[PDB]
Design a binder for these strands. Structure first.
Ligand SMILES: [Cl-]
Ligand SMILES: [Cl-]
Ligand SMILES: [Mg+2]
Ligand SMILES: [Mg+2]
Ligand code: NA
Ligand code: NA
Length: 332
DNA sequence: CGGCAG
DNA sequence: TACTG
DNA sequence: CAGTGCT
DNA sequence: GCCG
């Protein structure tokens, strides 16, 4: 399993012997991403991780092609950056890219919405404010534009997780709440706070979003809601905005999901990430005739598959033939 | 040639 | 994979 | 449904 | 973009 990142520790990227190469490829990858070339950007992402994890500085066209995640096209850009120190294509990125990046950083606006605004002639958030037709989400996103681009100290994430846990455990002391995402992976700063809630009795998790959200709204803790389907009663997730009380506090993104205990480990695995780690592991499950989601690890379906027993993260690693990784080692 | 997570 | 419209 | 966001 |  040298071809899968979920099989390796992410700490390999700590000693990156190719920054002068990857720093330029990241710029190309971002241009493709904001321009909508989802797959070309994905390939660039995997090559940047392969290069970041390689043991030595790359020096040879042959050496480069041998690396999984690097083919002929990528090799030639490498040999170009090594020989000449610069990469010519970086001076031929569409001039539209910076504006596209500006717009697609509005929460709720993606590549298709950005490309449309650009075609209609908008070039600044000012134009967007005053001429674009915005969705309820995009309007909130626009209003917290800077805040949603800002990361917070992991100490503030702990306060936010504690706020949620105290509210939830107030009306059911048996609830378990866990902070996931970059927080659980050990990062010093967190872009948002990802809270996982369940009840170990297998049933008391049902019908608690309503109680929890009202409790957290009665405190003024929640300032905006991005996604919160709370009419059908099948609510699985919540995405919104919060702010801790007092001076010098910023608006922070908050994601909550409630899960039945039977799905804890898979829910825990998905929410802890990283995202590329998840896509790698899930891609690995497919090859082994399995299917991994936030709900379960299961076998392929009948042209309804069996659900494999996964009481802990460890068991999901074991069933996929992978060495276990601490959450901090899944930071791909 | 087509998938690329679910 | 779960939302929105 | 297309588009978007979550990890 | 890369991969099988
Ligand atoms: Cl991979
Ligand atoms: Cl576990
Ligand atoms: Mg996060
Ligand atoms: Mg989140
Ligand atoms: Na290769
Ligand atoms: Na966006």
């Amino acid at each position: 399993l040298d071809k899968w990142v979920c099989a390796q520790p992410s700490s390999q990227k700590a000693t990156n012997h190719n920054l002068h190469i990857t720093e330029k490829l990241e710029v190309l990858a971002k241009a493709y991403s904001v321009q909508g070339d989802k797959w070309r950007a994905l390939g660039y992402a995997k090559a940047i991780n392969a290069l970041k994890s390689f043991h030595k500085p790359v020096t040879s066209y042959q050496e480069a092609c041998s690396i999984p995640g690097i083919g002929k096209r990528m090799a030639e850009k490498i040999i170009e950056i090594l020989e000449s120190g610069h990469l010519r294509k970086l001076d031929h990125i569409s001039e539209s890219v910076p504006v596209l990046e500006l717009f697609s950083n509005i929460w709720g606006a993606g590549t298709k919405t950005a490309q449309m605004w650009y075609q209609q002639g908008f070039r600044s958030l000012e134009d967007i404010r005053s001429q674009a037709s915005l969705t309820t989400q995009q309007a909130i996103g626009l209003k917290h534009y800077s805040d949603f681009l800002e990361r917070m100290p992991r100490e503030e994430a702990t306060e936010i997780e504690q706020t949620v846990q105290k509210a939830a455990q107030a009306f059911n002391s048996g609830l378990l709440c866990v902070a996931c995402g970059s927080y659980r992976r050990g990062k010093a700063t967190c872009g948002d706070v990802d809270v996982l809630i369940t009840h170990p009795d297998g049933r008391s998790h049902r019908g608690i979003f309503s109680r929890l959200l009202d409790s957290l709204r009665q405190e003024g803790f929640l300032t905006d809601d991005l996604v919160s389907q709370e009419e059908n009663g099948q609510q699985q997730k919540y995405l919104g905005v919060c702010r801790l009380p007092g001076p010098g506090r910023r608006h922070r993104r908050l994601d909550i999901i409630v899960v039945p205990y039977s799905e804890f480990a898979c829910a825990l695995l998905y929410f802890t990430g990283s995202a590329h780690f998840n896509r790698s592991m899930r891609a690995l499950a497919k090859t082994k005739g399995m299917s991994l989601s936030e709900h379960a690890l299961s076998t392929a379906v009948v042209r309804p598959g069996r659900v494999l027993p996964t009481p802990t993260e460890k068991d999901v690693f074991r069933l996929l033939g992978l060495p276990y990784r601490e959450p901090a080692e899944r930071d791909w």
